[PDB]
């Protein structure tokens, strides 16, 4: 059955964000006029949070727990789907096709993705999503 759905975690294989992990915000299987192929609107992590040790001060922990996000339109041929799933209610329709046509909407969407992802990271769940892939 179909697996490229919402909350599917994928690995980006080409582009500036190659090797990064994304969550699928919206699948467009039939394509659009601007992208006449199966693609997806995804959000993901550009800079992963750093490792935390038991002797670190709380200010250093807060500094190293920061996440830099990104939002992307990406072809299906440039994605590697993973069995993992990241379910977030704050990322529901955070980006659409008209988001990428204006720089300010992209910044606001990235801020929302940032706050939701740091909340999930500080929760302690889904550690595979927040660790970087080593290749």
């Amino acid at each position: 059955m179909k697996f490229l759905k919402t909350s599917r975690v994928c690995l980006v294989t080409r582009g500036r964000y190659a090797g990064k992990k994304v969550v699928i915000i919206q699948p467009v299987d039939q394509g659009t006029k601007s992208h006449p192929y199966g693609h997806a609107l995804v959000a993901g992590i550009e800079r992963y949070p750093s490792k935390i040790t038991r002797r670190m001060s709380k200010a250093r922990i807060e500094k190293r727990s920061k996440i830099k996000p990104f939002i992307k339109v990406i072809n299906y041929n440039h994605l590697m789907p993973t069995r993992y799933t990241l379910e977030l209610e704050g990322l529901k329709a955070v980006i659409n096709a008209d988001t990428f046509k204006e720089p300010s909407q992209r910044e606001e969407a990235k801020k929302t993705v940032k706050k939701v992802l740091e909340d999930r990271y500080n929760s302690g769940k889904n550690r595979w999503f927040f660790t970087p892939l080593r290749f």
């Binding site: 935390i52 040790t53 038991r54 922990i61 727990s65 550690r127």
Partner: peptide, 29 residues
């Protein structure tokens, strides 16, 4: 309460798995 972001990364020092730790090699100096 301990930080949930803390993780254990054990090293398996078997043959062909990890880099061997620095041991006391004083018998073989």
């Amino acid at each position: 309460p301990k930080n949930p972001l803390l993780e254990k990364r054990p090293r398996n020092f078997g043959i062909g798995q990890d880099i061997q730790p620095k041991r006391n090699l004083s018998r073989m100096v």
